[PDB]
Amino acid sequence: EAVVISGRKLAQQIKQEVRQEVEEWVASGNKRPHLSVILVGENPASHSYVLNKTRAAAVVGINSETIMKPASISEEELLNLINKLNNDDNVDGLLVQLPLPEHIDERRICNAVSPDKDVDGFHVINVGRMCLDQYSMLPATPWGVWEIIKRTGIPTLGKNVVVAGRSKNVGMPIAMLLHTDGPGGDATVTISHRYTPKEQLKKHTILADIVISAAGIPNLITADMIKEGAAVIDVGINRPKLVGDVDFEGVRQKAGYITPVPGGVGPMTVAMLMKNTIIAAKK
Amino acid sequence: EAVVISGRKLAQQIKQEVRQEVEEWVASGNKRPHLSVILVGENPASHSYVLNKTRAAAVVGINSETIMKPASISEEELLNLINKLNNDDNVDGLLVQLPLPEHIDERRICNAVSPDKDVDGFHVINVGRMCLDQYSMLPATPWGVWEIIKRTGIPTLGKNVVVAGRSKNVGMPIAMLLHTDGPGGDATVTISHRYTPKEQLKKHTILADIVISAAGIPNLITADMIKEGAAVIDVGINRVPKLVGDVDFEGVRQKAGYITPVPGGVGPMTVAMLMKNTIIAAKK
Numbered sequence: 349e350a351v352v353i354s355g356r357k358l359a360q361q362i363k364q365e366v367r368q369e370v371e372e373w374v375a376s377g378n379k380r381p382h383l384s385v386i387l388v389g390e391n392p393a394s395h396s397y398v399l400n401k402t403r404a405a406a407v408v409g410i411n412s413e414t415i416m417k418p419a420s421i422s423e424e425e426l427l428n429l430i431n432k433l434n435n436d437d438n439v440d441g442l443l444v445q446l447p448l449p450e451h452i453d454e455r456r457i458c459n460a461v462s463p464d465k466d467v468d469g470f471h472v473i474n475v476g477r478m479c480l481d482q483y484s485m486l487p488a489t490p491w492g493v494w495e496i497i498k499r500t501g502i503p504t505l506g507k508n509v510v511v512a513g514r515s516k517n518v519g520m521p522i523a524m525l526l527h528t529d530g531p532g533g534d535a536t537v538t539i540s541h542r543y544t545p546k547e548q549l550k551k552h553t554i555l556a557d558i559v560i561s562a563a564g565i566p567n568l569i570t571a572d573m574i575k576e577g578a579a580v581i582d583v584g585i586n587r588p589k590l591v592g593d594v595d596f597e598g599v600r601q602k603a604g605y606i607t608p609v610p611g612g613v614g615p616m617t618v619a620m621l622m623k624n625t626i627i628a629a630k631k
Numbered sequence: 632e633a634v635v636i637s638g639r640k641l642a643q644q645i646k647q648e649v650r651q652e653v654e655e656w657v658a659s660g661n662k663r664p665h666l667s668v669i670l671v672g673e674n675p676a677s678h679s680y681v682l683n684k685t686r687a688a689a690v691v692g693i694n695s696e697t698i699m700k701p702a703s704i705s706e707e708e709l710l711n712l713i714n715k716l717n718n719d720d721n722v723d724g725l726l727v728q729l730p731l732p733e734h735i736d737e738r739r740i741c742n743a744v745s746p747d748k749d750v751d752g753f754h755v756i757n758v759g760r761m762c763l764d765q766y767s768m769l770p771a772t773p774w775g776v777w778e779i780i781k782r783t784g785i786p787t788l789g790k791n792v793v794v795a796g797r798s799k800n801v802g803m804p805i806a807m808l809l810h811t812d813g814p815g816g817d818a819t820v821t822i823s824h825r826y827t828p829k830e831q832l833k834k835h836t837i838l839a840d841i842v843i844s845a846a847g848i849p850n851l852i853t854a855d856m857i858k859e860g861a862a863v864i865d866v867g868i869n870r871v872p873k874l875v876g877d878v879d880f881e882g883v884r885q886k887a888g889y890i891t892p893v894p895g896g897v898g899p900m901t902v903a904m905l906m907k908n909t910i911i912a913a914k915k
């Protein structure tokens with residue numbers, strides 16, 4: 349049977365590592381780190397995720413605030429808030445929770461966060477730095493997927509990795525990290541587009557040593573699609589319950605490793621954000 | 632038998648479009664576009680490629696200069712020259728021909744070119760904009776591969792593309808463009824890694840509607856790796872004393888539905904797209 353990797357448990361010990369790094373940095377005489385999160389509107393998924401982020405910040409000794417604004421705010425008002433937080437020497441990390449209302453250009457907002465405070469890694473120069481391996485801050489979800497693979501010990505060097513992506517923003521950063529010269533992953537990588545039918549994806553998945561599903565489609569990954577003992581990482585978030593992309597009971601019979609949803613990649617995203625925030629506070 | 636796509640012929644159409652775009656722009660009273668190329672040292676392939684670029688510039692109405700420096704140039708003098716050209720208002724496009732001598736850090740050099748003049752798209756800002764679909768300019772070779780596919784009319788949406796890259800810088804931007812939502816192909820893309828087993832790659836190429844080989848090993852792509860009707864695009868450059876691509880051209884010519892030759896395929900398309908990037912930069 350597949351060994352189940354507890355993302356929650358691994359995230360909790362990464363948080364314990366961050367806490368002691370934070371307490372060391374403060375005992376050494378430095379300002380306690382502070383994370384500011386901007387939340388716009390009433391998306392229930394966004395509010396839940398931001399709650400998990402600020403809870404984790406408390407666990408690791410990082411001060412935090414969630415600044416909640418109504419969905420009717422204008423782009424210029426959001427830019428003014430970001431400029432204020434950019435110039436506030438108490439703020440080490442700044443991220444805007446996405447998605448934003450349609451009258452706000454998401455790309456302009458992310459590029460307005462100071463690159464040094466951009467703990468999500470969404471600023472265009474931080475994206476460029478990540479592609480060129482010139483970075484210091486990785487986006488939290490791809491870095492969390494990498495930490496799962498690395499801390500478990502799943503081999504990548506010369507293996508076949510398949511990533512099924514809902515969008516380029518989701519699958520490509522994951523594949524970027526996994527394809528890169530050794531982070532780094534030194535693996536052959538497929539990034540499947542959502543317009544590729546399930547039957548064609550299957551011919552890619554059956555060859556994969558590592559399957560990473562980020563498609564937001566329930567039951568997209570079933571046991572017939574996986575060679576025996578492959579690692580299956582479920583990033584899908586699907587909604588009166590919450591399910592991933594993987595047929596968990598099904599492929600548990602065939603995979604060598606599997607991550608559950610909830611309790612898998614989700615907690616690792618939050619834990620890697622705390623890593624980025626102590627990184628930002630020390631720069 | 633495969634259709635043989637003529638890179639020279641498509642590049643000619645693209646260069647005709649740039650010339651018309653340039654003459655109209657000049658007709659309206661604007662400055663003629665100018666491209667500056669910095670060429671360091673005596674790499675014979677680099678000189679040949681830069682000459683192709685400046686010849687294409689002249690025939691489309693774009694002014695050009697190649698600034699040749701010896702390989703023993705220091706990194707500081709190269710940076711000083713780049714800073715001079717960044718501030719020269721006559722210069723719309725600036726590119727540094729790579730590779731540079733070992734004592735020079737090329738990432739520092741590429742990031743020293745003004746992003747507004749970076750017609751190669753190698754500056755870290757422009758790498759990011761390409762990833763985020765914020766760009767004005769695209770790397771010439773990835774954009775050339777895309778135009779070959781798009782202008783020939785080879786379907787990409789939901790199709791299987793394999794890119795066999797010699798490094799991340801080569802394979803990733805090509806894969807990026809083809810994976811992007813429709814440039815952009817909406818395609819599933821495999822990026823095989825350097826030194827990947829030929830039989831391991833075979834398992835992915837067999838499924839591919841489009842095989843893009845950019846690995847620089849002769850005869851990487853033989854017929855037993857292709858499904859019938861597939862499009863094969865040869866980006867390889869190899870000396871064996873003559874230039875050949877990565878594809879066994881005569882062998883794959885039977886199997887494939889489309890094939891590009893080397894020379895005469897991607898090569899001229901790379902040069903032509905740089906001409907597009909240069910008028911884009913001059914237009915700001």
Ligand SMILES: Cn1c(Nc2ccc(C(=O)N[C@@H](CCC(=O)O)C(=O)O)cc2)nc2c1c(=O)n(Cc1ccc(Cl)c(Cl)c1)c(=O)n2C
Pocket residue numbers: 391393394397446447454458469470471475478479487489516517518520521524585762763
């Ligand atoms: C701008 N952005 C975005 N936006 C975005 C995110 C979520 C939602 C949403 O609705 N999210 C859903 C689900 C969220 C989830 O997936 O958990 C919700 O919560 O309601 C809508 C928009 N997600 C990005 C980037 C970005 O910039 N980067 C840098 C990057 C780095 C390397 C490369 Cl190669 C590339 Cl391409 C991009 C990224 O890594 N991610 C991942």
Ligand SMILES: Cn1c(Nc2ccc(C(=O)N[C@@H](CCC(=O)O)C(=O)O)cc2)nc2c1c(=O)n(Cc1ccc(Cl)c(Cl)c1)c(=O)n2C
Pocket residue numbers: 479480676677729730737741752753754758761770772799800801803804807868
């Ligand atoms: C820094 N660089 C380099 N260097 C480089 C190029 C050629 C040679 C050489 O010796 N070339 C030989 C072999 C032939 C050939 O290369 O044509 C020669 O010319 O004689 C040596 C070094 N090539 C890059 C980038 C880069 O920055 N970008 C942006 C980019 C955009 C999106 C993404 Cl995702 C990424 Cl990762 C990167 C790129 O697209 N290419 C393609």
Ligand SMILES: Nc1ncnc(O)c1NC(=O)Nc1ccc(C(=O)N[C@@H](CCC(=O)O)C(=O)O)cc1
Pocket residue numbers: 396397400443444445446447468488489585590609610611612613614615617618
């Ligand atoms: N949208 C964004 N804008 C800006 N920066 C970002 O990083 C994002 N993306 C996220 O914030 N993604 C995210 C997804 C799930 C969790 C999470 O905590 N999942 C739990 C609980 C499940 C649930 O509450 O439904 C689990 O899986 O166990 C946390 C973050």
Ligand SMILES: Nc1ncnc(O)c1NC(=O)Nc1ccc(C(=O)N[C@@H](CCC(=O)O)C(=O)O)cc1
Pocket residue numbers: 679680683726727728729730751771772874893894895896897898899901902
């Ligand atoms: N190194 C770089 N540094 C900075 N920016 C770049 O873009 C590059 N890369 C190139 O400039 N790549 C390139 C390769 C071949 C041709 C070409 O014209 N090929 C001919 C044969 C030519 C011959 O061998 O004489 C053909 O195939 O028909 C043109 C450009």
